[PDB]
RNA sequence: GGCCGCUCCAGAAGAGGGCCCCCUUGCCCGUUAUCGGGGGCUAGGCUCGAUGUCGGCC
């Protein structure tokens, strides 16, 4: 059997100061024979700690990781701003070696309301035959947003996707896109187009529509 | 001191093969154990393949034993991956690391340093260029703020596109999605931005895409 | 019934072996390689034995 890696949370927000803590269940007993691993986006890992508590050379004090069991923690003593990336443990009691998900470490700042803004499809796409429409949720924060689609009332489903910009360099807000892909026929067959989005920072759902 | 530079990856068809390299520099092979990990997009980790040079041992995860090789050459001073009979499952960036070996260690420990992995896609996609469609600011503005708009950028393979607004003369609020696989094995992406309500009359707004795989180059203008 | 034997078949049969937990490898050890000691479960499943309900021979 492999020995699975458990790792939580899946992300968390803190800032430069704060102590954080990461932990990583193993599936059964390792013993101390778990590493821990940096990544910051599209770039090479980096080793950390090994043995579960070891700092391996470069690696500055401030991280540290200990064993309770074959619960694994790795822990920020004081953060850093170049310490948002995400982190990996991995388990090499037995081979084949393994990795758990990774803690993504974001940076926390106050919660901001999204600006939705919604855009029918261009004449020029109609013509091909397809309708994309698509709805932004501009500089908001945190990253959990919800974005509905309802055509003439009628609920979506399996016919939209998201993508989300990273933090922004400045603010630290999100940025989120949801296209809802139809045909051309199903287009005109309908009169009503209505993006509907909640978020922590709106009391109430935010609906942005237009008809043709 | 240390390096690990990958390279022999790219886009292949499925059932076709490929060749990694991972050419290390500043340690000697024989003083390590090489290992393949990959990430396959938006996923964690996941190791692939091991070999220690010193001894010709090697070992396979499970999903690729039978198709994958793993292999080193000292006198080169680099290791290699033979890929053969890919599935689309097998797309992911593939990492290669080192374990240095020490004399009193009795196992293998942890992975201690990286190279900066290549991209292996896995689909049956043909590259094709990309149509720019204009997100168009509402004709609805709240009138005395900001407006938004946009280029959509559909049906392109294989990424990346380079977007950017005016010819670079316009990059406050400019948010560029990241790109998405439709349903048909192509990418999709959007662009936008947001400017004064005030500047929609009387500033023109055209944005530039720029897909290289297919030498490809739009302009499109948005307009009410 | 005697003598031999384990290629086969028994499970009526030990000891390997295996699994889990602890000790940052902790008597001596350790394949460019994850051990040892301790605690707890594993039996007919693999190797090797033993045995007969097995096989051979006079």
């Known amino acids: 059997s492999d020995i699975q890696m458990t790792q939580s949370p899946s992300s968390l927000s803190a800032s430069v100061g704060d102590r954080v803590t990461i932990t990583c269940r193993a599936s059964q007993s390792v013993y101390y024979s778990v590493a821990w691993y940096q990544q910051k986006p599209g770039k090479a890992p980096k080793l950390l700690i090994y043995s579960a508590s070891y700092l391996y050379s470069g690696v500055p004090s401030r991280f540290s990781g200990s064993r309770s069991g074959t619960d694994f923690t790795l822990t920020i003593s004081s953060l850093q701003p170049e310490d948002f990336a995400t982190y990996y443990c991995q388990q090499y009691r037995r081979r084949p070696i393994t990795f758990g998900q990774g803690t993504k470490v974001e940076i926390k700042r106050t919660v901001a309301a999204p600006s939705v803004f919604i855009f029918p499809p261009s004449d020029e796409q109609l013509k091909s035959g397809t309708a994309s429409v698509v709805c932004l949720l501009n500089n908001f924060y945190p990253r959990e947003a919800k974005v509905q689609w309802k055509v003439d009332n009628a609920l979506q489903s399996g016919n939209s996707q998201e993508s989300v910009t990273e933090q922004d360099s400045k603010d630290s807000t999100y940025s989120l896109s949801s296209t809802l892909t139809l045909s051309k026929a199903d287009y005109e067959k309908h009169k009503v187009y209505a993006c509907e989005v909640t978020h922590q920072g709106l009391s109430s759902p935010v609906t942005k529509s237009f008809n043709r | 001191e240390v390096q690990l530079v990958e390279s022999g990856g790219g886009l292949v068809q499925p059932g076709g093969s490929l060749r990694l390299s991972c050419a290390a520099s500043?340690?000697?092979?024989?003083?390590?154990?090489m290992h393949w990990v990959r990430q396959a997009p938006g996923k964690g980790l996941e190791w692939v393949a091991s070999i220690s040079p010193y001894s010709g041992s090697t070992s396979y995860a499970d999903s690729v034993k039978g198709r994958f090789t793993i292999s080193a050459d000292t006198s080169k001073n680099t290791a290699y991956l033979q890929m053969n009979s890919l599935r689309a499952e097998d797309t992911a960036v593939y990492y290669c690391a080192r374990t240095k070996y020490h004399y009193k260690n009795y196992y293998w420990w942890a992975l201690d340093y990286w190279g900066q992995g290549t991209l292996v896609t896995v689909s049956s996609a043909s590259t094709k260029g990309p149509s720019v469609f204009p997100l168009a600011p509402s004709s609805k503005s709240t009138s005395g703020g900001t407006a938004a708009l946009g280029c959509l950028v559909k049906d392109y393979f294989p990424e990346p596109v380079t977007v950017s607004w005016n010819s670079g003369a316009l990059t406050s609020g400019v948010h560029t999605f990241p790109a998405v696989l439709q349903s048909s094995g192509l990418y999709s992406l959007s662009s936008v931005v947001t400017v004064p309500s005030s500047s929609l009359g009387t500033q023109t707004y055209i944005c530039n895409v720029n897909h290289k795989p297919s030498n490809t180059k739009v302009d499109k203008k948005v307009e009410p």
């Open positions: 500043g340690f000697s092979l024989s003083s390590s154990s």
